[PDB]
Amino acid sequence: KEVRKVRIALASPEKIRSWSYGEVEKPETINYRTLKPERDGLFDERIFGPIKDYECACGKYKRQRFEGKVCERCGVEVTKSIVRRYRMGHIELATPAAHIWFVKDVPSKIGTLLDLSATELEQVLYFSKYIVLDPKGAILNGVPVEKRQLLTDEEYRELRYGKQETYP
Amino acid sequence: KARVYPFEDDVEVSTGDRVAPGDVLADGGKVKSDVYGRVEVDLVRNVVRVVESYDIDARMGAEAIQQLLKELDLEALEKELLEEMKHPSRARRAKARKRLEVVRAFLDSGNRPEWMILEAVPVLPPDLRPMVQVDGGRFATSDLNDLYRRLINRNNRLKKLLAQGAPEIIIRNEKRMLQEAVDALLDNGRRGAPVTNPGSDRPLRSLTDILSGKQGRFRQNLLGK
Amino acid sequence: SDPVRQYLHEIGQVPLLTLEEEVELARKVEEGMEAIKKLSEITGLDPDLIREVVRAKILGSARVRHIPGLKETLDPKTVEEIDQKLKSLPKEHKRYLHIAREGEAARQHLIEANLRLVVSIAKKYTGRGLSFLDLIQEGNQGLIRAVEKFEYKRRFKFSTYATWWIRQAINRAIADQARTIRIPVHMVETINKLSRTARQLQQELGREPTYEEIAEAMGPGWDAKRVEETLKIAQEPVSLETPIGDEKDSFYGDFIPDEHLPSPVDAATQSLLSEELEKALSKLSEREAMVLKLRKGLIDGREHTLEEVGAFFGVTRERIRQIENKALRKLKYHESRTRKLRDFLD
């Protein structure tokens, strides 16, 4: 077929995982002695592909008769090495993180969607103020807690863990 | 600021539990809860103390923001903003137009707003950020590898601090550092100080820098070569 | 704005302990660990699962996740089940539950109270390849280990025992993360011993040492070649985006040619080689050409044994070897006559 259009759109975590051939779990590049890629690191042939055409990492499969075969000893597909330019990997985050393009490109798309000013989105995103998702009937300073309210750390602790003090 | 409730028999709630008015504290249900708060079982004093506090859900960071963005019903907001577009004040009409533009972009495109928050971070193919032996046996490498390494170290330490039940100050620090790691990977220099390699003032070259500028991908290798 | 200023503020929130509060918290921690041991004795459950449940309830439902060592996935359902099996204990048994809960709360407050010591230690490890914040977090990991291993019966203040594990964690992280090409901890130690040794030799010699002088100062088992190999293995990579020239114009990587992908001359020479080989194989009969293509790997990529080609054509291995030999002989004759394949031998 002939290319006629080029679309660009946001990618879902499921889409990003669909691209990925493996999760990069170790911050390691190559071995200081073998000068071969480390397992589950940024250059792993198990994830991104063979370094030599139609040859797995250990050496059990080394010709084109095996094509698409995944070696059982080392786990590297036998294809062309060109694929190390194309196969994405991914990192699974413990906490979600905001894509800075949609935060710092004013007017912020996130902060516009949620009616959150640049200062408020900054304070929540870089852990300077809490934001309420459910007040569970909380009351602060004589007014009840409305959703999407910006509580400082002192206020959040006074609400969530109560007031107290110690005197010497 | 707490509420005392002595007890004489087997107590039914342990330390740390969240209590609401009308909850059974001890003695098979005889002594119960008055105020909202948190349970401090004092066995020395034989009293079940309750310090007044609500069970309020208040988060920080992209987890909170992602929740809120998931919670957006787009058509409802479009309706509210259309109603706002009939307002006399020109500023309110302007703001509702600027918001409704984003809303309708997401609606007509089919993109979920929450997708502006990353759970899985993609990793570029290794040949596009090579680790090559230069003539003579030494190694040259792209900056993206050090940015990804920062990211993966901080993410792994976060997973371990979670699995090991760390306090809140520490998890908060780790999460802040993780957001900034991602930010440096994607648009280093944009927010805050730019990440540099040790012993050099040079900013590392992130993905945005690869795309744009005089030396960016478009002008340097796509519109001319 | 500045993340270290923010963390220093959050650290300045929790007040510093008095000797009494320190001893009290440490004591509660020890007694809570003992109580979890006793609860494992009674319930016959796993001590780690019990600790995870007590921790889950003390921290709240805000944090609940699957622990790697646990055999069961830690979700609020199973923690409610285990908390109910715990709450259904006799008074003198259920007492240990409150003990463990208070111990966990003391653990949290002890860590938070001593978070400043980590900063005051880590500030002296800057410039070794790790960000200040990275050092602070690794030191906090050391502080958690110290809390879990402290013994208040020894009457030592907590700072003393904590400083050991804090330094340990900082140095382990510097040794495990600083290099883009990761080097084992023992090899990093040997490299730094070599560095310090050569620096002493230069400080006494008035010049940089040779490999041999460093081998002398390193002791036995060390010769000049080993010093050289160690220095070679310790070399760190350089940035592909290193500036060349004084403008913002060129990168160092722009001058590095790609050796991997074949050049157009290479691809063309391979193509002409394959076509000339087919030209020379068409001067054989179909069988001798097929035997050569099977025995050399031009058909399916691999070389077959004489027994396989003989079983495929239905002849003896001696006969298949003989027709391979006569095919090679005809090819040698044709090549001597036409010389159409010589130039490809380089």
Added chain:
Amino acid sequence: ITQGLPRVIELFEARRPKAKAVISEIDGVVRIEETEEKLSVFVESEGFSKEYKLPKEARLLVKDGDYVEAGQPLTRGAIDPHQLLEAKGPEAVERYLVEEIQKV
């Protein structure tokens, strides 16, 4: 004495010039009002009246009691293209831009 490449750029970007001339939002007739300390110019339609207050030393391209088109220059200087667009329409702005660029 010209403005050169900066003038060309000021035109192609449709920037409101620094030394901007004032133009009439409507048609009408001119009535000058000049105190020894302040100066203003009034454009008066058959039922309307606009007031253009301007600093003392501004050069006028208009004689008192004249009939000026909507968007016609009163002060000397470079016309704001967006003001011209609102007052007189697209063809006027196209003429103005083409001619002003060609002058350089």
Added chain:
Amino acid sequence: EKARDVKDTSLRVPPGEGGIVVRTVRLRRGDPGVELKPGVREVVRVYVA
């Protein structure tokens, strides 16, 4: 003919250059006064006039 273990990586004259050799310097590892950077066995310099 067996494929030799090694390959030709010699330093040739680049396109559009040349002249008369006037100096050669050779430094080898294991020679007096000489120590190269880690890894290199020998360094050769040719001066062409």
Added chain:
Amino acid sequence: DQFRVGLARLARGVRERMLMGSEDSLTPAKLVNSRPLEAAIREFFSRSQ
């Protein structure tokens, strides 16, 4: 100026080693790491504008 910067880094290292270490046996040779000064000068002379 570049010398002054190298000296400042050397002094930072000096105080670093002064705080810790067996304070009975601390010579000048045990406190001075000359490397930051060397690096500052080498930088000035090799890669300054």
Added chain:
Amino acid sequence: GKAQFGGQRFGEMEVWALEAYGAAHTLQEMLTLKSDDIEGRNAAYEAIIKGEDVPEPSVPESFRVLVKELQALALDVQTLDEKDNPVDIFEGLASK
């Protein structure tokens, strides 16, 4: 650079020059067969040494690099046809 046996830079403005002439094919050569269409450059060299006309080019590799560097920024970039159905410029080599 001469020292690297390098090629001349045919930059943005040289591209404009070729565009203003309407030399679509000369320009497409510069953008594919002579720079970074790998298959294209190989096939062109082979056709010339054989005496054939040069083949029609294909995708320049740096555009594939652009697609992958956008994917690295969580942006899905999709070459479509007129039926809005995706086209794979990676020839399957990166789709599981």
Added chain:
Amino acid sequence: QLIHKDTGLIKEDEVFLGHIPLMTEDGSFIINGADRVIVSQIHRSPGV
């Protein structure tokens, strides 16, 4: 010289700090075998 304030102990030594490039007779330098020149810089003089 090192001095412990309380102990009064005073240990003295001449330590080696590396090398400083020397300028040749004609005002140039020799860095890694190649002659180099440090160019004077003009700037705004300090003051009020």
Added chain:
DNA sequence: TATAATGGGAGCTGTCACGGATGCA
């Protein structure tokens, strides 16, 4: 694995003009 140790340093500066978002009165 055990004296006690409990909040950081570096800024670094002769444009410039525009455009667009925020901030006040």
Added chain:
DNA sequence: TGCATCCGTGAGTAAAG
């Protein structure tokens, strides 16, 4: 409804380096 004020962004080509 209008202004000052701040932040982000861009500022020529090829060559050698």
